[PDB]
Design a protein around this ligand. Structure first.
Ligand SMILES: OC[C@@H](Nc1ncnc2[nH]ccc12)c1ccco1
Ligand SMILES: [Cl-]
Length: 167
């Protein structure tokens, strides 16, 4: 039993809700919130900009130190950093950004990072401003993640499209 509420159950391990991931994290305080990161951990827009804003820029300050020490992430890769006021941990995961010409096949690799955590609150990787098809992202999620994932989503109209189209 966990404290996630109002989710539709898609499979044994994947749940989905129309929700603002910032507000969801602030309510649930999950062990892990997933950020839709880029390799530079520059949290400018989309989910990343919103999560960082909610931390009063502390996420960005921590991220800049991480990059200065370690260099950029790989597309498809991840790192675990603080969850600040939103969660215990933030798993920063880099899905391919189609608006940069990155290989959509890397989306499966990106979702594999979720399997290192028993339970996660997450967005659909590579959706929104990363330019991939969200129906595809949900399919890859369901076919790749084996741990318990709670997907938030932001856009009420896509949420309805994702449910009604879900196979
Ligand atoms: O992963 C992309 C996804 N973005 C978010 N999902 C959940 N909560 C959010 N809060 C702020 C942004 C955001 C999206 C946007 C439009 C279509 O898909
Ligand atoms: Cl987005």
């Amino acid at each position: 039993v966990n404290s996630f509420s109002g989710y539709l159950k898609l499979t044994d391990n994947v749940y989905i809700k129309n929700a603002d991931i910032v507000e969801e994290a602030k309510k649930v305080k999950p062990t892990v919130v997933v950020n839709a990161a880029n390799v530079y951990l520059k949290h400018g827009g989309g989910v990343a900009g919103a999560l960082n804003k909610a931390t009063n820029n502390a996420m960005q300050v921590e991220s800049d130190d991480y990059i200065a020490t370690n260099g950029p992430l790989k597309v498809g890769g991840s790192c675990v950093l603080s969850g600040h006021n939103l969660a215990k941990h933030c798993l920063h995961v880099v899905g391919p950004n189609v608006n940069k010409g990155e290989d959509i096949q890397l989306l499966k690799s990106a979702y594999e990072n979720f399997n290192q955590h028993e339970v996660l609150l997450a967005p659909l990787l590579s959706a929104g401003i990363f330019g991939a098809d969200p129906i595809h992202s949900l399919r890859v999620c369901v076919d790749t993640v084996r741990t318990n994932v709670y997907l938030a989503v932001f856009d009420k109209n896509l949420y309805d499209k994702l449910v009604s189209s879900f196979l």
